[PDB]
């Protein structure tokens, strides 16, 4: 109930494949600040599953290392919102993609918006897409984002973005 966009027409099985965490943004700063901040996470691939769910694969800096985590995201009635497991009843919100170049999704927590919402601009290939960043950047004024991070193709090709 803060993210007012969500895409009508989501063919999930078309989001499959790899992506790079190019850009990402959040509501308060403590959440992404340092490499080891909680929602500092790097999406590496989308396996849409047969049930219609989506397995998410992502690296994250924690105990000194770049650590994989598998996150599975369960269907809901809305095609574009999926519920994730961990520490509250969750949403992954998919905002916009063309399937083939970029993909915009946020990640909130129904218990605590202005403190949980984190958003990401994903891309299919390790290069900056201005127009994706365009579309990312223009979708988060309706949102109270307070930190923005951008990464460059080299950091995209490395573990945990350096
Ligand atoms: C905004 C997402 N939402 C739950 C998925 C926030 C509630 C807290 C739980 C720990 N969220 C998480 C679920 C799964 N992995 C996580 C890795 C990190 Cl650093 C932080 C939160 C995570």
From TrEMBL:
Q: Which SUPFAM superfamilies match?
A: Lipocalins
What cystine pairs are annotated? 66-160, 106-119
Give the originating organism. Bos taurus (Bovine)
Show the GO cellular component annotation of the record. extracellular region
Described by its record, this protein's role is as follows: Primary component of whey, it binds retinol and is probably involved in the transport of that molecule.
Compartments annotated for it: namely: Secreted
Under the GO molecular function aspect, what terms does this record hold? identical protein binding; retinol binding
Kindly give the Pfam families that the UniProt entry links to this protein. Answer: Lipocalin (PF00061)
Read off the PROSITE patterns from this record: LIPOCALIN
Q: Which CDD domains match?
A: lipocalin_beta-LG-like
Alphabetically list the UniProt keywords: Disulfide bond, Milk protein, Retinol-binding, Secreted, Signal, Transport
Segments forming domain Lipocalin/cytosolic fatty-acid binding: 16-152
> Belongs to which family?
Belongs to the calycin superfamily. Lipocalin family.
Top-level taxon of origin: Eukaryota
Protein name, entry field: Beta-lactoglobulin
- Family annotation (InterPro entries): Blactoglobulin (IPR002447), Calycin (IPR012674), Lipocalin (IPR002345), Lipocalin_CS (IPR022272), Lipocln_cytosolic_FA-bd_dom (IPR000566)
